[PDB]
Amino acid sequence: EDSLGMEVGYRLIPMVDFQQDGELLGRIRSIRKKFAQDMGFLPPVVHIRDNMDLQPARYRILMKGVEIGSGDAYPGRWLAINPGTAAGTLPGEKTVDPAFGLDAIWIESALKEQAQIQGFTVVEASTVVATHLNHLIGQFSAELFGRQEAQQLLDRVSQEMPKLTEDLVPGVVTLTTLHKVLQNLLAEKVPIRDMRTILETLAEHAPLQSDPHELTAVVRVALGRAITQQWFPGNEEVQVIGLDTALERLLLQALQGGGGLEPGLADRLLAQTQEALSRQEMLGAPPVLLVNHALRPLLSRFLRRSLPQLVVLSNLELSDNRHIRMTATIG
Amino acid sequence: SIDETVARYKAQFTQLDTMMSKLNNTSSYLTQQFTAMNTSTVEFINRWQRIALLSQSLLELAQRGEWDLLLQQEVSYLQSIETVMEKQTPPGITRSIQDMVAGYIKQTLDNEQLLKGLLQQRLDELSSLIGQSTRQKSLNNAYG
């Protein structure tokens, strides 16, 4: 079916109609526009379709026909989101915010200012659906970047810098290999904007390496200035989570065939990591875990499977001029 | 401007934590000078009364939440203790004036034990405020 689709009930029709309100269409266009300039690729168009059989205020979001999210939206009302610090309760339909799962209440338009004073974040109905749609796009950035968009991006960059793309595909790397490398970049929220450095460093390591996972690692170090500034913008103190030195050598030994740890120690590794995100949060520091380069792909695939908000960077990617301090420890 | 207010929370956290460390440097100096007490006579009561009064000022500012003014009075409170360090006890100490000062020195100790207890709970509150403000920043970026 369609790559990105959204079905809506009849009460949401005005929100998706150029003949009247249509606040969603402008927001969806802005979502796809900023997503193309931030992450470096244009996401598929969103096919919006009315469904009078659906509930009046219900909407659905589908990816290749599979439902990836539902929810409600009431155009005349506001959603009062409780981030954990709000006080009291407000009359309305109690629900859950679609982005973070927090407790929320759909309040009448006459309670917006009272909600704000009580500590709620009040969000309009069209933004609730747009934010939910924008949230899922970022969550499935790697999936929405299929092989078609890989060829589409290649031809787009083959006209800007023809000398780099001509000698590359399919000579040193095939279209399948370049696609898998770019998928690994979007899978960890690193943008593929700088196609020069990606393809330049690909041509230097392709004749010696044909493994997509290995080529991805080299590319991330080539993109180290962008990866550093993405989570540590400016020139101040870099505050990262680290591994206990005893744990780092235990993990290096397990990969080197010296002996792995008990499966129960893995459960503590997940728990201690989640506690490290909370301790890092209390300090106002980014939720990034700095590990040895040999351990980065393993812990990235392992921790982010349960805690996707975690960012795993290698020591070879951070700029050598920054002042690094380990503010939290796992182990 | 959540990013600007978090910076203020971090700056006040380190300033209050530095004061809570210098609070222990003066807690050892006052406890030892307290046990050492168990015309120039007038300018000896005032040197120990200015310490007991400034420690009262810090405790009142801590109870009333005037943390910015509490950090301005820390300087004068530290200058006043060094004035007692430079000038020793006069030779003419009566049993009545020595034990009257011993009540003023004991007043600053009980004022610092409550001040440190309040200076600590502000650090505990600032850590919550920084954590809540960064979680609130994630909400504003998603819906903004």
What CATH number does residue A100 fall under? 3.40.30.60
Judging contacts by C-beta atoms under 8 Å, the chain B residues touching residue A99 are: 139, 142-143
A117 and A160 share a domain?
Answer: no
Judging contacts by C-beta atoms under 8 Å, the chain B residues touching residue A281 are: 131, 134-135
Judging contacts by C-beta atoms under 8 Å, the chain B residues touching residue A131 are: 142-143
A122 and A69 share a domain?
Answer: yes
CA dist A113 and A10 (Å) reads: 29
For A61-72, give the DSSP string: EEETTEEEEEEE
- Write the DSSP symbol of residue A53: T
Using the 3D structure, point to which of A130, A145, A160 is the last residue of a domain.
Answer: A145
Number of domains in chain A: 2
Cβ pair B119, B62 in contact under 8 A: yes
- Write the DSSP symbol of residue A15: G
Whether a cis peptide bond, with omega within 30° of 0, leads into A170 is: yes
Chain A closest CA to B142's CA: distance in Å? 6
Cβ pair A287, A280 in contact under 8 A: yes
A166 and A300 share a domain?
Answer: yes
Q: What resolution in angstroms does the PDB record give?
A: 2.7
A13 and A134 share a domain?
Answer: yes
- Asked if A83 and B139 come within 8 Å (Cβ–Cβ), the reply is yes
- Asked if B134 and A281 come within 8 Å (Cβ–Cβ), the reply is yes
Domain range spanning residue A240? 146-331
A199 and A289 share a domain?
Answer: yes
Judging contacts by C-beta atoms under 8 Å, the chain A residues touching residue B5 are: none
- Asked if B132 and A284 come within 8 Å (Cβ–Cβ), the reply is no
- Asked if B140 and A121 come within 8 Å (Cβ–Cβ), the reply is yes
Q: Which residues pair with A6 in a beta bridge?
A: A48, A61
Nearest to A188 by CA among A278, A61, A299, A273: A299
A308 and A164 share a domain?
Answer: yes
Domain range spanning residue B76? 1-144
Method: X-ray
A151 and A237 share a domain?
Answer: yes
**Residue A195 main-chain phi, psi, to 5 deg:** -70, -20
Judging contacts by C-beta atoms under 8 Å, the chain B residues touching residue A283 are: 127, 130
Residues shown for chain B: 144
Using the 3D structure, point to which of A120, A145, A170 is the last residue of a domain.
Answer: A145
- Asked if A83 and B135 come within 8 Å (Cβ–Cβ), the reply is yes
Calculate helix-pair angle for B67-86, B2-35, nearest 10 degrees.
30
Tokens encoding A102:
């927090």
CA dist A312 and A84 (Å) reads: 27
Helix (H) or strand (E) segment spanning residue A48:
strand A46-50
Cβ pair A99, B143 in contact under 8 A: yes
Number of domains in chain B: 1
CB-CB neighbours of A47 under 10 Å: 13
Using the 3D structure, point to which of A101, A123, A145 is the last residue of a domain.
Answer: A145
Q: Who among A102, A128, A284 is closest to B134 (CB)?
A: A284
A140 and A154 share a domain?
Answer: no
Calculate helix-pair angle for A125-139, A23-38, nearest 10 degrees.
30
